[PDB]
């Protein structure tokens, strides 16, 4: 669907200018699946998963079960099906954004698992994550699905063009 592949998209970032992206969310949000769905190389476990591609680093841990310096973006992943864990996803998101080391990070939310029938819309997610009153930072929500692969490149294209803009 999207007009360019992911590698063309990420191709656009200054071929060197190290990019650090934290992709965080509650367990079962679908973060390991997106890492895999990106088809960018393999995931290193260390608990923590990292995917390095050219200049760009992706680091993943689960929330709600220092490290934040020099972060260019936060990808926040939510399971759009999981109604009653979504208030906890909101809390953990708010915990992240009160971090001083993160004050200039872009925020991309993936409203995820949008292939499923129970899947809230972007406005239900923005309302639930109470994003719609975050006005001190550049953010968006994009509907996504690791089972399709849908939303993912759009979301990364968002990040790439916001990163170049600065």
Which residues are known binding-site members for GTP? 25-32, 65, 112-115
- Closest residue to Mg ion in the complex (CB): 32
Nearer CB in complex with a copy of itself: 70/165: 70
Among positions 19, 29, 153, 156, the unique one binding ligand GDP when judged by CB under 6 A: 29
CB of 25 to ligand GDP, least distance (A): 6
State how far the Cα of 20 lies from the Cα of 56, in Å rounded to an integer.
Answer: 6
5 lies in the site for a copy of itself, by CB under 8 A = no
State how far the Cα of 112 lies from the Cα of 31, in Å rounded to an integer.
Answer: 9
Tokens of 156: 């990364």
Among positions 15, 16, 46, 98, the unique one binding a copy of itself when judged by CB under 8 A: 46
State how far the Cα of 129 lies from the Cα of 122, in Å rounded to an integer.
Answer: 10
Mark the binding-site residues for Mg(2+), compressed into ranges: 32, 49
State how far the Cα of 92 lies from the Cα of 103, in Å rounded to an integer.
Answer: 16
62 lies in the site for ligand GDP, by CB under 6 A = yes
CB 86 within 8 A of CB 29: no
CB of 68 to a copy of itself, least distance (A): 8
CB 26 within 8 A of CB 64: yes
**Contact region for ligand GDP (CB under 6 A) — 27-35, 85-93, 101-109, 151-159?**
27-35
Among positions 73, 93, 145, 163, the unique one binding ligand GDP when judged by CB under 6 A: 145
Hey, what's the torsion of the CAs at 125, 129, 130, 134, to 10 degrees?
-110
State how far the Cα of 138 lies from the Cα of 131, in Å rounded to an integer.
Answer: 11
**Contacts with ligand GDP, residue ranges (CB under 6 A):** 25, 27-33, 62, 112-113, 115-116, 145-147
């Amino acid at each position: 669907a999207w007009l360019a592949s992911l590698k063309q998209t990420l191709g656009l970032l200054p071929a060197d200018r190290k990019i650090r992206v934290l992709m965080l969310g509650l367990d079962n949000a679908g973060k390991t699946s997106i890492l895999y769905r990106l088809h960018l190389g393999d995931v290193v476990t260390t608990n923590l998963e990292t995917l390095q591609y050219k200049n760009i680093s992706f680091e993943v841990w689960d929330l709600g079960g220092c490290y934040f310096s020099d972060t260019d973006a936060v990808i926040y992943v939510v399971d759009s099906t999981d109604r009653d864990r979504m208030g906890v996803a909101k809390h953990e998101l708010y915990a992240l954004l009160d971090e001083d080391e993160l004050r200039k990070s872009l925020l991309l939310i993936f409203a995820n698992k949008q292939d499923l029938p129970d899947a809230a819309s972007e406005a239900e997610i923005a309302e639930q994550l109470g994003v719609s009153s975050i006005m001190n930072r550049t953010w968006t929500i994009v509907k996504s699905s690791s089972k399709t692969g849908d939303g993912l490149v759009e979301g990364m294209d968002w990040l790439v063009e916001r990163l170049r803009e600065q």
